[PDB]
Design a protein around this ligand. Sequence first.
Ligand SMILES: C[S@@+](CC[C@H](N)C(=O)[O-])C[C@H]1O[C@@H](n2cnc3c(N)ncnc32)[C@H](O)[C@@H]1O
Ligand SMILES: C[S@@+](CC[C@H](N)C(=O)[O-])C[C@H]1O[C@@H](n2cnc3c(N)ncnc32)[C@H](O)[C@@H]1O
Ligand code: SF4
Ligand code: SF4
Ligand code: SF4
Ligand code: SF4
Lengths: 327, 326
Amino acid sequence: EQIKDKLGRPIRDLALSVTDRCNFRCDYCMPKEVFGDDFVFLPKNELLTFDEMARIAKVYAELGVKKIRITGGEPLMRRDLDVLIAKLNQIDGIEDIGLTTNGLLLKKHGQKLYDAGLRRINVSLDAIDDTLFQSINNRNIKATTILEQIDYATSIGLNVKVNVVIQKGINDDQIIPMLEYFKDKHIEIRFIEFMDVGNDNGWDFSKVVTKDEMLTMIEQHFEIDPVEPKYFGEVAKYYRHKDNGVQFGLITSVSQSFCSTCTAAALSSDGKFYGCLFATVDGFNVKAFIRSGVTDEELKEQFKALWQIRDDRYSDERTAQTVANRQ
Amino acid sequence: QIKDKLGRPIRDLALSVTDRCNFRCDYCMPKEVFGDDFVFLPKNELLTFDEMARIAKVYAELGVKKIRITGGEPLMRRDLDVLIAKLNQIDGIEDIGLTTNGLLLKKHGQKLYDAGLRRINVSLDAIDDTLFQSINNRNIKATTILEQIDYATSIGLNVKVNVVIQKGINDDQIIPMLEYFKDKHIEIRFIEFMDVGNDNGWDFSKVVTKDEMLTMIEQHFEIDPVEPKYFGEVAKYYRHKDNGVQFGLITSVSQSFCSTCTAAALSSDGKFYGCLFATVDGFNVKAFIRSGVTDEELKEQFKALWQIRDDRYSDERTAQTVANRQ
Ligand SMILES: C[S@@+](CC[C@H](N)C(=O)[O-])C[C@H]1O[C@@H](n2cnc3c(N)ncnc32)[C@H](O)[C@@H]1O
Ligand SMILES: C[S@@+](CC[C@H](N)C(=O)[O-])C[C@H]1O[C@@H](n2cnc3c(N)ncnc32)[C@H](O)[C@@H]1O
Ligand code: SF4
Ligand code: SF4
Ligand code: SF4
Ligand code: SF4
C-alpha cells in the first residue's frame, strides 16, 4: 500500500502522456528542425488505449498513487480524452487529476472535460506579447488566443493555473507584464527556470534567469510577502501581492534542485515506464507486458518492482556535476 | 577528478582536533553522559599535527581546498597555532576556518591569527545571559562570548556567528541577536534545529523553519533577499535595507542539501566519515597510518573511500518525512 524507491521516496504521482502529437513546435521542446515534415509520429495502435491507462492507474492507486497528471505532447489533441477523464474519475484512491496543456483547444474540449470530472488545468504560456509568443511556438498562434481560452476555461468552472518558462534574452521581459495581467484575473502564475544541460555537463546558465534574479526584478515593481509552504517539500516558492493577496510562485528547477522529494512516475505515449521526466534510454515496456496477457496481480508486482529499484535524480545529478565543473 | 557515488567531488575536510569541550550544551554534550567520570581520548590516541598535515596534503592533491577545524571545542587543543601554520603551507589548501564557542579567544586568538587563521565561526545560541547559561551548563555569560567576539574582530579575524534555533528554548533570541550583530556589522546565521523522530523522519516539534523565521524577521526589520554568491551556496542570504549588513538562514531540515555536499570528516580519534552524521564506525585512518604507509598508499586509500561514498543523511530523513506524511 506504500512503496519506497532506492532513495526512500514513496510513489505518489503518475504523469500520463496521452499522445506524442502537438499543435505547437516550441523551439526548446519540439523544434521543427527535428519534428518537421518528415517526422513520423506513433502509429495509433502503438498508443495505450484508455482502458489500458485506467487499468494501469488502478493498480498504481493500490500502491499509493493519489494524483494523475495528463500530459503529452499536447493532450487535447488526443481524441475523446473526456472518456479517459471519466474512467480515471472512477478509480478509488485517486484524489486529483490535472491537465497540462498549451490551452489552444480549451474552447473546443473544455466542457466535455469538465463534464467527465476535470477541475484543474495548468496552462503553459511563455509570453503575453503576440509577436514574441508566435516566434516561440512557431505555429503562428497568438498569446491573445490563449488568454481567451483561459477566460473560457474559468467561465465554465475549471480552475486555471499558468506556467511560464523564462529564457534569458527571450522572454525575461514578460515577467512583469504576466504578473500584472494574471494578478488582475486572480489567477496563480508560476515562473520556471529554464533547464539546459551544457557540454561539461552540468547546467548551462547562459539562458537561465534564476528564481533569485527573477525575485530582484519583481521587488522593484511590486510589494510582496513570502508565503510559508502549505506542506513539507512543496517545490514552488510562493509569494503574494499585498493588495489583493493573489499568489504567484517561482520554481527553482536549476538553482535549487528537488529530486529528494520526487514522488512521480511517468508513462510515455508509447507506454514505457520512467521514474523521471528526463530519460535518455527506453524504459520497461509496460504496453507489451499488458498486451501479452497478465493478471492484475502480475501487473501490480511488476509496478512495485519498478518503483523499488528506482533511483532517478537527473536534476540533482546535473547539480553535482555543475559543482564539480567549477573545479 | 575524484567524485563519489552521487557524483559529488571532495572540496572540504572537517577536521576534529579534540573530543574535549569547556561547555556542556544540552543538545550536544549533555552533562549526563559527559560527567566527571568520563574518560576522553588519551593524548596518544589523538592524531599528531604531523599526521594531520600529512593527511591534509594528500587530500589537497585529491581536490580539497578548505579545512574546517572543530572538535569538541578546538581551542582546548594543544598548541593549535602550530597545526594551523603547517596547514597554511599546503598549497592546495586555500581556506582554513575554525568553529568555536569562542570562550578561549582572548587566550588564543592572537597566536592563531599569527599562524594564518583569518576566519572564525562562533556558535552562540543565546544573547541573553540567563538563557545562555542554562543552554551551556557551565555558567558562561553571553556577555563573555560577546566580548570575545569583539576581541577577535579587533585583532583582524573575520567573524560570523551561528545560532541553532530550538522552538521552546531559543525562539525569542532571533530579533535581539539580529539587532545586536547588525549594529556590529557581523553576519549571523540562524540554523534549523535537526531532530529525528521515532518515525525516522524529521521531528518538527522543536523546529522553527527558515520560512517562519522570515515571517518573524519581516515584522521587525526591512529586508532584501541576497542573490546566492555562487551556485549551490547553502545559506539563504538577506540584507538589512538601511546599512546593508547581511544575515543568513540555513534550511537544515526544511530544504536539505546533501546533493551539493563536498565534505569529508576526520574525527579526533582519527576515523574517516563521509557524513557529519554516521552510525557506522569509519575507516580507521589512524591505525592505517601508524602501520607504515607511503603517501601514494594513503592517497589511493582516501580516493577509494571517497569514490565509494553515498552519504545523504539529511536527504534520507527528508524522504522519510515525505513518506510519513503518507
Ligand atoms: C512537454 S509539455 C506537455 C504539455 C503541453 N503540450 C504543454 O506544453 O503544456 C510540458 C511542459 O514541459 C515544459 N518544458 C519542456 N522543456 C523544458 C525545459 N527545457 N525547461 C523547462 N521546462 C520545459 C514545457 O514548458 C511545458 O510546460
Ligand atoms: C560540535 S560543535 C564544534 C565546534 C564548537 N565546539 C562550537 O560549538 O561551535 C559545532 C556545531 O554543532 C552544532 N550542533 C550540534 N547538534 C546540532 C543539532 N542537532 N542541530 C543543529 N546544530 C547542531 C552546534 O550548534 C555547533 O555550532
Ligand atoms: S506545446 Fe507543449 S508539448 Fe508542444 S512543443 Fe510546446 S511545450 Fe512542447
Ligand atoms: S529530475 Fe528529479 S525531480 Fe525531476 S522528475 Fe526527475 S527525479 Fe523527479
Ligand atoms: S560547545 Fe560545541 S562541542 Fe561543546 S557541547 Fe556545545 S556545541 Fe558541543
Ligand atoms: S547530512 Fe548531507 S550535507 Fe550533512 S554532511 Fe551529511 S551528506 Fe553532507
